[PDB]
Enzyme design. Sequence first.
Site, PDB file in Angstrom:
ATOM      1  N   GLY A   1       0.871  -1.128   0.168  1.00  0.00           N
ATOM      2  CA  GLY A   1      -0.102  -0.125   0.187  1.00  0.00           C
ATOM      3  C   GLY A   1       0.962   1.061  -0.090  1.00  0.00           C
ATOM      4  O   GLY A   1       0.283   2.328   0.402  1.00  0.00           O
ATOM      5  N   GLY A   2       2.059   1.318  -0.465  1.00  0.00           N
ATOM      6  CA  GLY A   2       3.149   2.314  -0.795  1.00  0.00           C
ATOM      7  C   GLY A   2       3.337   3.189   0.614  1.00  0.00           C
ATOM      8  O   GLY A   2       3.612   4.140   0.515  1.00  0.00           O
TER       9      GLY A   2
ATOM     10  N   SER B   1       5.400  -5.250  -1.066  1.00  0.00           N
ATOM     11  CA  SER B   1       5.886  -4.135  -1.504  1.00  0.00           C
ATOM     12  C   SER B   1       6.088  -3.211  -0.595  1.00  0.00           C
ATOM     13  O   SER B   1       7.399  -3.492  -0.190  1.00  0.00           O
ATOM     14  CB  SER B   1       4.256  -3.193  -2.110  1.00  0.00           C
ATOM     15  OG  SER B   1       4.260  -1.893  -2.139  1.00  0.00           O
ATOM     16  N   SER B   2       5.544  -2.209   0.401  1.00  0.00           N
ATOM     17  CA  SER B   2       5.872  -1.348   1.278  1.00  0.00           C
ATOM     18  C   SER B   2       6.283  -2.288   2.262  1.00  0.00           C
ATOM     19  O   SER B   2       7.593  -2.025   2.965  1.00  0.00           O
ATOM     20  CB  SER B   2       4.936  -0.524   1.820  1.00  0.00           C
ATOM     21  OG  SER B   2       3.739  -1.218   1.798  1.00  0.00           O
TER      22      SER B   2
ATOM     23  N   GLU C   1       6.982  -5.496 -14.006  1.00  0.00           N
ATOM     24  CA  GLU C   1       6.901  -4.428 -12.992  1.00  0.00           C
ATOM     25  C   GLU C   1       7.940  -3.353 -13.095  1.00  0.00           C
ATOM     26  O   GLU C   1       8.813  -3.638 -13.696  1.00  0.00           O
ATOM     27  CB  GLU C   1       7.318  -5.193 -11.561  1.00  0.00           C
ATOM     28  CG  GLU C   1       6.258  -5.795 -10.984  1.00  0.00           C
ATOM     29  CD  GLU C   1       6.266  -6.001  -9.310  1.00  0.00           C
ATOM     30  OE1 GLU C   1       6.624  -4.942  -8.682  1.00  0.00           O
ATOM     31  OE2 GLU C   1       6.483  -7.232  -8.958  1.00  0.00           O
TER      32      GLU C   1
ATOM     33  N   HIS D   1       2.538  -5.869 -10.928  1.00  0.00           N
ATOM     34  CA  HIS D   1       2.934  -5.732  -9.453  1.00  0.00           C
ATOM     35  C   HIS D   1       1.737  -6.380  -8.626  1.00  0.00           C
ATOM     36  O   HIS D   1       0.565  -6.180  -9.033  1.00  0.00           O
ATOM     37  CB  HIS D   1       2.933  -4.275  -9.021  1.00  0.00           C
ATOM     38  CG  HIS D   1       3.210  -4.067  -7.283  1.00  0.00           C
ATOM     39  ND1 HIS D   1       2.293  -3.775  -6.349  1.00  0.00           N
ATOM     40  CD2 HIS D   1       4.509  -4.287  -6.776  1.00  0.00           C
ATOM     41  CE1 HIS D   1       3.114  -3.672  -5.431  1.00  0.00           C
ATOM     42  NE2 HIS D   1       4.342  -3.921  -5.602  1.00  0.00           N
TER      43      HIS D   1
END
Lengths: 321, 321
Positions: free
Chosen positions: B77-78, B161-162, B263, B294
Amino acid sequence: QVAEDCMGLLQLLSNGTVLRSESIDLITQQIPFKNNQTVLFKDSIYHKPNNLHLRLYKPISASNRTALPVVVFFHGGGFCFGSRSWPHFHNFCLTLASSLNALVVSPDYRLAPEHRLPAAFEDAEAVLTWLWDQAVSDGVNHWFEDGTDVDFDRVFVVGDSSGGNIAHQLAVRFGSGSIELTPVRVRGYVLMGPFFGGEERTNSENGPSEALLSLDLLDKFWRLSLPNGATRDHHMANPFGPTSPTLESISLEPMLVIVGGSELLRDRAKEYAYKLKKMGGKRVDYIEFENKEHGFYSNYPSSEAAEQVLRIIGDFMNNLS
Amino acid sequence: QVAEDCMGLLQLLSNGTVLRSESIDLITQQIPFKNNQTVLFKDSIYHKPNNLHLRLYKPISASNRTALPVVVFFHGGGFCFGSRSWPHFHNFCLTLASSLNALVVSPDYRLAPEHRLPAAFEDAEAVLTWLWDQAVSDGVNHWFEDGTDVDFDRVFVVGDSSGGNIAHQLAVRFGSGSIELTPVRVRGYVLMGPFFGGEERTNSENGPSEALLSLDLLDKFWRLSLPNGATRDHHMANPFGPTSPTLESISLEPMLVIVGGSELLRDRAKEYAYKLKKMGGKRVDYIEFENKEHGFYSNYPSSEAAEQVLRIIGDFMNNLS
């Protein structure tokens, strides 16, 4: 003011919920020898000025056999979020196309707060108008590399959340005879967890928050989506607002309302359906999936409930075709 | 300024992408006689002051047979979005638990811009400390209604991700001997599409946008997440920034880096892995799924690629256990 509401949206969106006690879920295991199907898709512009695109989906093996019905799918996201290209919606459309053996049309629409309602509804009509234009001009033959056979006499609108509201707005506009797009014929509407609102709360709306949705979050969507100064009883949120069209005099096509039993929006959705039922001349099926929260059908694609929703939409389509 | 960045985030998030030509995807059909498994889960607070919760998952039939390894899953979720309760992440954890036969720990962590980095990393350490506390105090017996047998000598961190960045930060803190939590032993790290950044762009970063991610969106996450005035070469974004710890002198546990071939973050991820490989003493596997964007592993749970990722994580765990 709008910028503050945006900061508060971020907080509400990712707040989640806390389970009061332990729970159990069922999960489908990986299994070899799965059945598979190919789905062709491409994007094209449907509204040049606003640079709005839609995605077309065709199940390959099914389009060889007969003329495909059309499913126009409007994605959710509270009028503030979403894109046809998002994996979540793309995956759902792949499923719709293959499972329903249908040509699926999946449009973007302008989002709030940059574009407040009724922008989304205007875009929805432009989608149907674009479809009309394609239908009367043999545009369909240029959709994909090969030919495509489409039955424009069998169109269905499937709306998820905000998209369910959009579906209702279209149902009214068509049913009132305000817009008419022969040879496009929309034979039925599927409203899935439709994002309807009201100034006064239902019982379910005052109930426990969901995995993602809370009443606060829903209120914030309306605050960002409705025109400045409007209340949640505005007709674009509340189908039965004091201004909202008298649906007794309108000829609505058959409607299917599908909701989760544990959804905040269940009561308003049920109330919507049963008010239509009583009005007479109106075929409305209401289906409640016990113990399910909002968007169960797309959030858990492998689940039994998701598969059952797809079968029911298919049966609904078959019955009306 | 932050409020303007928030308005721009909404726009970038839902912008999507336009396919230049038609494409085909494979979709798994509904099939009867699916294999199923139950997964018990519950929430509990791991940090009282910040009101931070984590969700515990236990596969039921598997916990009867032996002591479960632990998988600590950090959602993506960045650094700006997400919750352990979101259906998307909950579904992925159900899969992790059942597929890996593991006790899964899925924490919330504080999100930007309200809580800028390194808040998330601080929360990640509090999770591991909470686990330590539970391990040394027989807290595990009170996790669920019944008893639970957990092997704290076999902990694995899985970061999306994050969360992959978070996993790296933990790997460094443990590997440097800065924190030490016997009898908790983290035997390996899985970094899935890790959200690493740099002021200078890679080739993939300048490539075509994805279904959801764009370079603009990624930049905005860093702008909202990094401390005011920091660049993308700050060590919290760039593992090889000029300040970033000299990883030659650090003893990193085995790492698995998994990325989609299509990606934006593929090159930085590959570069990360191969820089570690060369440093020696470091077991790093790099795995690239051709043509995938992604989060393919969680965005398309039914897909072959998602199932293969789960098998590879499981094999990785088996090899190190």
